[PDB]
């Protein structure tokens, strides 16, 4: 039952830098450790195994060592399409332990998201539902808190977000989060408000307005 | 060329079972040992199962112990993956991967992976019904329909059990939506209507959920 | 590539009675041919194979001959528990084909179905469903057919029906159909009707209610 | 007592897949030739899979043939039914029946079976997607969308006034509700300038469902 723990959790690079990922061991594990490339939604790429052995076909820029109980990925001369997460893997006869995995971004500076509130269309309520939107819209870096209050009572297992990949153009993300009320949930309160809480912002923003206008 | 795709990923509620296979093409099974791997949300790596050549050994995650069970079929190259007694945090991208290398050893690693497919356990393993009136209007028909519960079963009593004459419960029907309905009726006098009450009691035991609903005239 | 016809298709009889249910095939299976019986909701029960040959634990009351492509299973003596679905099957070593069944249910005299429609309720049109109910009451034989109009507008595919087994005191069934729609195709349309067709009707029967009256 | 017990019926879409399974107690599967059986709607059972001893043979109701597959587990007891690329016409009771008898022979009856679990087919393969506007109500730049709830399966495209308008958008990806549809939502930051003047149409397309739809959004 060998504890795998990587590090750093989140690696932030730019174009043509040379980073290395820590894999450490909770007890030695020899050689038996393999390395892997994913990209999101799309399934993970064996890189390397036995600690050092490049994987027929895999670019000689990834390269693998150590040994023990610590062990180093490094890419030298980071490539656009490298930008993914990497896992770790010890990896015995008949079973196998990750780490927590390392998500490897393109840096850039902190920018403060712009936050927008959406409340529900009419034609929606009129059918039985109301869905709140609350967009959080370029931001850097990717950890932020979104919280929902209805009438000042903190909401929880009745909103769903999605985070967009990193941008093309300006290396931020967007998020969007939904809250879903049944019609009379939604008719039996009025001020309806979001917080975001984020590095690149002094203090949260909270987005809020009232039913009905 | 290889390839590995899995099936029967879904939306299944807590304390459910599902089943998930994995076919290949462009090789054999038989010579490999067949691992299930899944990815949480947080986007970590978690290793599920593995199951051994001619199925001598079968290992799985504690996490998992207990509730799944992993089959091979090397005769039609397919692996299948048995949960049962789910849980919400087994909610993850599941991949079937293979065990290999361009020459097999006792120990390689994952070298080809299923594209996954998408298993979400929904936190609620119950819902209590909404009870809503089938309102009459000399042999009068009136009643409850049971709407929107789950799992079966519910019980239905007319003024705490003491009409008992006339009364018909149907059998459940499952709905498109995956929660159950069913309605409870009763034939009574024509002029009872206004003059003596008519409650319905709902007892749904899964959820510990009563229910009384008086059906008057409108 | 054997089919199997089974006969009569509804077989209605008296506690007491002798009944004999016949299954032909459509060419020679020797005596490869099984019994079971089947109570709704039940398990298949095997009560003979070998075409006469009884399983262990079946009461003596049922029997089983033919040969070739005639086969008979007999019922001496009518219980209440013999009341269920009969199924002829043959099996062959690696595969099997099953006759369409034959429903054994207790003979009354007909009687037409009480009918009667319900709205949806208010509560439930707020909550954006709106579920209308016809039930047949007290009614014999079980075939039946009902129809949903809107607006003279027959439906399909937005029904579903439930119906009870034969009842323990008078012998009859009753039967529950469930149109769903959303709020907007209920209120989008003023007349709702259901239209049974049964054995003891001299006619079809229609009941209909006009929506908010 | 000799028992079977079947896991995984549910809901499932048309053209969709789910899987069966089956475990025994009291008795180990390896000697019997194991078999899967429905009872449709009308009432009938309908023999719909057989696979032998060993695998050796596998055998199907023709109406099935290329769309099911039956496999064994021997070791731990378990018998497995795939069904792919399923039709309103599979949806039924099924049950997993043990061949056998007192003393085995070459060709035995189906001496035990499980209490069958339900397995049901909806009609309907696809749904197509509701649209519902993300009207603007800071600064230089206003915000706006559409909400696309309610559609299955993926994928679905969103476009802006044609295709004219993309510098700005942000199509996010899908998410799975726990009703079993998906939903998304699609935005544009604008100057604040333009509402009023300019008007703005999402144009989505579930190609899954030949379904489009053209929105126009607009304040308040």
């Known amino acids: ?57 895999v670019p000689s820029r990834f390269s693998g060592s150590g040994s023990g109980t610590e062990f180093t990925l490094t890419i030298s001369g980071l490539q656009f399409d490298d930008f993914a997460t990497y896992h770790c893997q010890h990896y015995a006869g008949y079973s196998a332990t990750f780490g927590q995995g390392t998500r490897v971004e393109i840096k850039r500076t902190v920018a403060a998201p712009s936050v927008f509130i959406f409340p529900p269309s009419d034609e929606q309520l009129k059918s039985g539902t109301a869905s709140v939107v609350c967009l959080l819209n370029n931001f850097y870096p990717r950890e932020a808190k979104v919280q929902w209050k209805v009438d000042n009572a903190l909401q929880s297992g009745n909103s769903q977000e999605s985070v967009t990949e990193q941008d093309s153009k300006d290396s931020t993300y967007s998020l969007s989060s939904t809250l879903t009320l049944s019609k009379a949930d939604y008719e039996k309160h009025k001020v309806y408000a979001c917080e975001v809480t984020h590095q690149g912002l002094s203090s949260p923003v909270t987005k809020s307005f009232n039913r009905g206008e | ?134 309102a009459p209007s000399g042999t009068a028909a009136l009643g409850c329909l049971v709407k929107d519960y789950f799992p079966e079963p519910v019980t239905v009593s007319w003024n705490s059990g003491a009409l008992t004459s006339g009364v018909h419960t149907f059998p459940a029907v499952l709905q498109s939506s995956g929660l159950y309905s069913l309605s409870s009726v009763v034939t009574v006098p024509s002029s009872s209507l206004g003059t003596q009450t008519y409650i319905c009691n709902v007892n749904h035991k899964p959820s510990n959920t009563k229910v009384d609903k008086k059906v008057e005239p409108k």
Request: proline share 5%.
């Open chain 1, 1 to 57: 039952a060998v504890v795998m723990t990587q590090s750093p959790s989140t690696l932030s690079a730019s174009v043509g830098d040379t980073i290395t990922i820590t894999c450490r061991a909770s007890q030695s594990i020899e050689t038996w450790l393999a390395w892997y490339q994913q990209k999101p939604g799309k399934a993970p790429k064996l890189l390397i195994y036995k600690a050092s052995t490049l994987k027929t076909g």
């Open chain 2, 1 to 134: 060329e290889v390839q590995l795709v899995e099936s029967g990923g879904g939306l299944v509620k807590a304390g459910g079972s599902l089943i998930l296979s994995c076919g290949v093409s462009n090789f054999r099974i038989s010579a490999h040992t067949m691992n299930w791997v899944r990815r949480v949300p947080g986007g970590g790596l978690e290793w599920v199962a593995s199951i051994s050549t001619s199925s001598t050994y079968r290992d799985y995650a504690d996490a998992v112990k207990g509730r799944f069970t992993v089959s091979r079929d090397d005769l039609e190259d397919f692996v299948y993956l048995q949960m049962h007694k789910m849980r919400v945090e087994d909610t993850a991208i599941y991949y079937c991967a293979r065990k290999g290398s361009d020459r097999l050893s006792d120990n390689d690693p994952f070298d080809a992976w299923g594209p996954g497919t998408v298993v979400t356990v929904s936190p609620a393993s119950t819902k209590g019904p909404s009870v809503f009136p089938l």
